[PDB]
Design an enzyme around this catalytic site. Structure first.
Site, mmCIF file in Angstrom:
data_model
loop_
_atom_site.group_PDB
_atom_site.id
_atom_site.type_symbol
_atom_site.label_atom_id
_atom_site.label_comp_id
_atom_site.label_asym_id
_atom_site.label_seq_id
_atom_site.Cartn_x
_atom_site.Cartn_y
_atom_site.Cartn_z
ATOM 1 N N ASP A 7 38.400 37.828 39.266
ATOM 2 C CA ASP A 7 38.499 37.944 40.720
ATOM 3 C C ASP A 7 39.514 38.633 41.335
ATOM 4 O O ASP A 7 40.739 38.504 41.104
ATOM 5 C CB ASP A 7 38.562 36.460 41.058
ATOM 6 C CG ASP A 7 38.192 36.226 42.656
ATOM 7 O OD1 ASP A 7 38.388 37.099 43.454
ATOM 8 O OD2 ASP A 7 37.529 35.144 42.850
ATOM 9 N N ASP A 105 34.261 41.858 44.670
ATOM 10 C CA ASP A 105 35.446 41.682 43.986
ATOM 11 C C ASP A 105 35.249 40.757 42.822
ATOM 12 O O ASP A 105 36.356 40.013 42.397
ATOM 13 C CB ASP A 105 36.626 41.218 44.824
ATOM 14 C CG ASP A 105 36.625 40.012 45.274
ATOM 15 O OD1 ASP A 105 35.377 39.446 45.626
ATOM 16 O OD2 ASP A 105 37.634 39.530 45.582
ATOM 17 N N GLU A 106 34.013 40.253 42.484
ATOM 18 C CA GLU A 106 33.774 39.262 41.391
ATOM 19 C C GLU A 106 33.048 39.804 40.184
ATOM 20 O O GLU A 106 31.886 40.476 40.632
ATOM 21 C CB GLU A 106 33.342 37.989 42.139
ATOM 22 C CG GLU A 106 34.103 37.463 42.948
ATOM 23 C CD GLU A 106 33.708 35.928 43.332
ATOM 24 O OE1 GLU A 106 32.425 35.686 43.056
ATOM 25 O OE2 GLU A 106 34.182 35.339 44.071
HETATM 26 N N1 LIG Z 1 34.908 35.368 55.333
HETATM 27 C C1 LIG Z 1 35.142 36.528 54.491
HETATM 28 C C2 LIG Z 1 35.713 36.434 53.247
HETATM 29 C C3 LIG Z 1 35.950 37.479 52.428
HETATM 30 N N2 LIG Z 1 35.655 38.696 52.816
HETATM 31 C C4 LIG Z 1 35.986 39.916 51.999
HETATM 32 C C5 LIG Z 1 37.555 40.396 52.117
HETATM 33 C C6 LIG Z 1 38.009 39.825 50.778
HETATM 34 O O1 LIG Z 1 38.820 40.978 50.348
HETATM 35 C C7 LIG Z 1 36.961 40.097 49.821
HETATM 36 C C8 LIG Z 1 36.665 39.043 49.012
HETATM 37 O O2 LIG Z 1 36.977 37.701 49.446
HETATM 38 P P1 LIG Z 1 37.879 36.470 48.564
HETATM 39 O O3 LIG Z 1 37.152 35.443 48.790
HETATM 40 O O4 LIG Z 1 37.904 37.064 47.041
HETATM 41 O O5 LIG Z 1 39.146 36.469 49.164
HETATM 42 P P2 LIG Z 1 40.434 37.629 48.859
HETATM 43 O O6 LIG Z 1 40.030 38.345 47.786
HETATM 44 O O7 LIG Z 1 40.619 38.275 50.216
HETATM 45 O O8 LIG Z 1 41.527 36.447 48.573
HETATM 46 P P3 LIG Z 1 42.050 35.986 47.016
HETATM 47 O O9 LIG Z 1 43.002 36.766 46.496
HETATM 48 O O10 LIG Z 1 42.470 34.307 47.594
HETATM 49 O O11 LIG Z 1 40.859 36.009 46.248
HETATM 50 O O12 LIG Z 1 35.611 39.493 50.618
HETATM 51 C C9 LIG Z 1 35.090 38.828 54.264
HETATM 52 O O13 LIG Z 1 34.861 40.088 54.530
HETATM 53 N N3 LIG Z 1 34.906 37.761 54.960
HETATM 54 CA CA LIG Z 2 39.401 37.769 45.548
HETATM 55 CA CA LIG Z 3 36.013 36.503 45.282
#
Ligand SMILES: Nc1ccn([C@H]2C[C@H](O)[C@@H](COP(=O)(O)OP(=O)(O)OP(=O)(O)O)O2)c(=O)n1
Ligand SMILES: [Ca+2]
Ligand SMILES: [Ca+2]
Ligand SMILES: [Ca+2]
EC number: 2.7.7.7
Length: 341
Positions: A7, A105-106
């Site tokens: 992740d 990102d997963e």
């Molecule tokens: N409601 C959302 C949630 C996420 N994303 C996008 C932005 C993030 O960069 C990506 C992956 O989201 P994650 O849930 O993995 O959150 P992050 O990677 O940003 O934070 P973390 O480091 O806690 O995973 O998807 C988005 O466009 N809208």
């Molecule tokens: Ca993430």
């Molecule tokens: Ca994620």
DNA sequence: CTAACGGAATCCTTCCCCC
DNA sequence: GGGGGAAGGATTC
């Protein structure tokens, strides 16, 4: 099984910081500007410097600026993040050919044939983290367990640039003690549906009668939670195939006028067809987001592929069908294609 | 023309035709 | 009784 889950940490914000290292140490907020008014839109994500003060994904941009008026606000450049993401996924293919790309990102990796126990799976996680940080300078989080669900939970526990193993002993403790709302697939509406039944842990689903649980969260989620509670969940890592491609745009103002909506609809079609990139869809769905942010959709599938011209004329007829059978004004209009040849 | 809010994707459920 | 499709809903990124 031994599942390794990757992740990427605050992915959109981190990619912007890699491309502009002067961003290091500052609160960075990645925004989705709707264009309706100044700073209208939502936050896609923010780094942990901004997230520590309550600037998280989903909240309005104008609310983020009331909290952090001096943060760096960048527009979302999703194609940049997609190309960076694709390169990291290609790095992950070198460690297991059973890999499941879950999102931008997963990724899940079945490393059952590559390591002997959790100590070796742990070390493989370090090797994967170091390889990604070496090639792309991106920090990630590794979760390792016996199935995909607990591998993702493991990554959620050690999230910011971490690596965590949930062995069979901790799996049993989590079935007893982990709050069921933190199980992937349980949102607030299903969670609040479990609470009103008194269910707060996975083990509670084994004492309740099945139909009392099924009749109100559904058969699938009931079997899904029961199999998790029995420590018998074991869905295999599967190659995921994109099943639909679409685009929805916010209109400058709400409208029920056909000639006013058509330019936005046609723009969504052109961009959707560009994203198709080969791939011939046989079904087209016109999707309208009403004033109340509800979602109305009318579709149509053909015995053949859909040319761009056919998509144009058929979308107008499907749009008229939406104005007929609903009377709420439309806020966002778009299209979605599926059933590829 | 700057108005209390994005955009994309999946799977499951309900209703209905159909065998 | 159940397969299979259209549309809504819930979830998640
Ligand atoms: N409601 C959302 C949630 C996420 N994303 C996008 C932005 C993030 O960069 C990506 C992956 O989201 P994650 O849930 O993995 O959150 P992050 O990677 O940003 O934070 P973390 O480091 O806690 O995973 O998807 C988005 O466009 N809208
Ligand atoms: Ca993430
Ligand atoms: Ca994620
Ligand atoms: Ca939840």
């Amino acid at each position: 099984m031994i599942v390794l889950f990757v992740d990427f940490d605050y992915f959109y914000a981190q990619v912007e910081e890699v491309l502009n290292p002067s961003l290091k140490g500052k609160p960075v907020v990645v925004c989705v500007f709707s264009g309706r008014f100044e700073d209208s839109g939502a936050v896609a994500t923010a780094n942990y410097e901004a997230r520590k003060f309550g600037v998280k994904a989903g909240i309005p941009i104008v609310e983020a600026k009331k909290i952090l008026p001096n943060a760096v606000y960048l527009p979302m450049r999703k194609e940049v993040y997609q190309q960076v993401s694709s390169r990291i996924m290609n790095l992950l293919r070198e460690y297991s050919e059973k890999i499941e790309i879950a999102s931008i990102d997963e990724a899940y990796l079945d490393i059952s044939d590559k390591v002997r126990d959790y100590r070796e799976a742990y070390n493989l996680g370090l090797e994967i983290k170091n390889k990604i940080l070496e090639k792309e300078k991106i920090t990630v989080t590794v979760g390792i367990s016996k199935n995909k669900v607990f591998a993702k939970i493991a990554a959620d526990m050690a999230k910011p640039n971490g690596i965590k193993v949930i062995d069979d002993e901790e799996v049993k403790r989590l079935i007893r003690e982990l709050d069921i709302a933190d199980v992937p697939g349980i949102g607030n509406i299903t969670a609040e549906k479990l609470k009103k039944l008194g269910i707060n842990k996975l083990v509670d689903t084994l004492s309740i009668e099945f139909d009392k649980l099924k009749g109100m969260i559904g058969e699938a989620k009931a079997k899904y939670l029961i199999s998790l509670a029995r420590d018998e969940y074991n869905e295999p890592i599967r190659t995921r195939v994109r099943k639909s491609i679409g685009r929805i745009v916010t209109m400058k103002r709400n409208s029920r006028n056909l000639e006013e909506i058509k330019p936005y609809l046609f723009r969504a079609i052109e961009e959707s067809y560009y994203k198709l990139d080969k791939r011939i869809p046989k079904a087209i769905h016109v999707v309208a987001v009403t004033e109340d942010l509800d979602i109305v959709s009318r579709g149509r599938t053909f015995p053949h592929g859909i040319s761009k011209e056919t998509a144009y004329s058929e979308s107008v007829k499907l749009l008229q069908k939406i104005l007929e059978e609903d009377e709420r004004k439309i806020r966002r209009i778009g299209v979605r294609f599926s059933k590829f040849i």
